[PDB]
DNA sequence: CGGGTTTTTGTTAAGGGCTGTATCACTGTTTAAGACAGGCCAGATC
């Protein structure tokens, strides 16, 4: 919990809000720039160098057989630990249509702080989830197999009931349960009774044997269910299978940032509570071996610009580091697009 | 097909009163974003 203003380099305009920060030891990337990528970087992928509160968004090439994807803006990405590797899901394409391609990020060959990467187009079969936005997927591990779980985020409407009118117009999906196989890249749809109403940009942490879900929007009725699930997956020989329990203390947010601060221990910073008060307190959620315990931790220090501004956006650097973001004054003397902040949690 | 007639028409040029449209003098008082190529430092390496 110590905040810190950070100062940007000349190409500070590609940082929009939804944007990703993948981390491969300890080395961030930033993805999901604005706008289709330049030819200063043709992939879109940047080295995300912060030192002395100064960062460089260095471009970063990819591989001699790696696929080039489109720089999304709500993606769902899981880090499968497991020859480290992340794992992209959905979003939306600079041209506002969503997608549904998965995408794998390796690292090729590195030499003294020059990498290389290689993002693989994973496609699915079976039951294909839905192209959408928003969504949370993490891989959870049982009985020495590991396996996705993607859970459901808004999308657009469906090539029938979609007018042109409302051509922008967006539901939440159906709250069903995606579990992925990626050995194979097959999907399997799971209706759990005890998951109600649709939800999306929540807050997913994994425990090696579940889906702890958490928060999060609700657009069917514009609310935000305070309540938590926690999704315990077992893999037989055979078909998989899922059950979920509904638990007290869980938080009332959406957009909130997550990233775990020491082993079993994470963080959680605001999201928003109401449509006029974006969240301010800070949430320690102490994991366990069976146990989830959602706690209040020491209320970090705001300054006056993030205590003014109403939307603020940002993701994990993957050190117990969120790295924030704000608009800044709109009608004020020539102020930038964004300011940047980043609070270490230790 | 004529052919005296109408019944209306076509024309001249000066000067003026009027009207409709073209012409005139004139005013702005540097770019911002992105692509590529040197060139020189600056560090990695034999």
């Known amino acids: 919990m110590s905040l810190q203003m950070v100062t940007v380099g000349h190409n500070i305009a590609l ?11 300890g080395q961030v990337f930033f993805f999901g720039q604005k706008g289709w990528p330049k030819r200063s970087c043709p992939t879109g992928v940047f080295h995300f160098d912060i030192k002395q509160n100064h960062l460089k968004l260095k471009p970063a090439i990819f591989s001699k057989d790696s696929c080039y994807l489109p720089p999304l803006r709500y993606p769902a990405t899981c880090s499968y630990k497991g020859k480290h590797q992340y794992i992209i899901h959905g979003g939306k394409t600079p041209n506002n249509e969503l997608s549904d391609k998965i995408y794998i990020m390796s690292v090729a060959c590195k030499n003294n702080k020059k990498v290389t990467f290689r993002c693989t187009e994973k496609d699915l079969v079976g039951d294909v989830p839905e192209p959408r936005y928003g969504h949370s997927i993490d ?9 996705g779980v993607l859970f459901g985020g808004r999308s657009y409407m469906p090539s029938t009931q979609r007018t042109t009118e409302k051509w922008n117009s967006v539901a939440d999906c159906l709250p069903h349960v995606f579990l992925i196989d990626f050995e ?3 999907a399997t749809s799971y209706i759990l009774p005890e998951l109600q109403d649709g939800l999306s940009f929540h807050v997913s942490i994994a425990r090696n044997d579940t889906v702890y879900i958490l928060g999060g ?8 269910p305070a309540n938590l699930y926690r999704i315990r997956v077992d893999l037989p ?14 938080i009332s947010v959406s957009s909130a940032i997550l ?3 020491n082993n079993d221990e994470f963080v959680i910073v605001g999201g928003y509570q109401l449509e006029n008060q974006k969240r301010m307190v800070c949430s320690l959620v102490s994991l366990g071996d069976n146990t989830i315990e959602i706690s209040e931790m020491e209320t970090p220090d705001w300054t006056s610009d993030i205590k003014h ?6 993701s994990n650097m993957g050190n117990g580091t969120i790295f924030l973001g704000i608009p800044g004054d709109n009608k004020q003397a020539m102020s930038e697009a964004f300011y940047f902040y980043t609070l270490r949690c230790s």
Request: proline share 6%.
């Open 237 to 250: 020989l055979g078909t998989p299978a899922v059950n979920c329990t509904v638990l007290p203390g869980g």
């Open 259 to 261: 990233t775990q601060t």
């Open 217 to 224: 929007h609700s657009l069917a009725s514009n609310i935000r």
């Open 309 to 314: 501004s109403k939307i603020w956006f940002g």
């Open 15 to 25: 940082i929009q809000p939804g944007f990703s920060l993948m981390n491969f030891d």
């Open 139 to 147: 891989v959870v591990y049982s009985r020495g197999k590991s396996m």
């Open 184 to 186: 194979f890249g097959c």
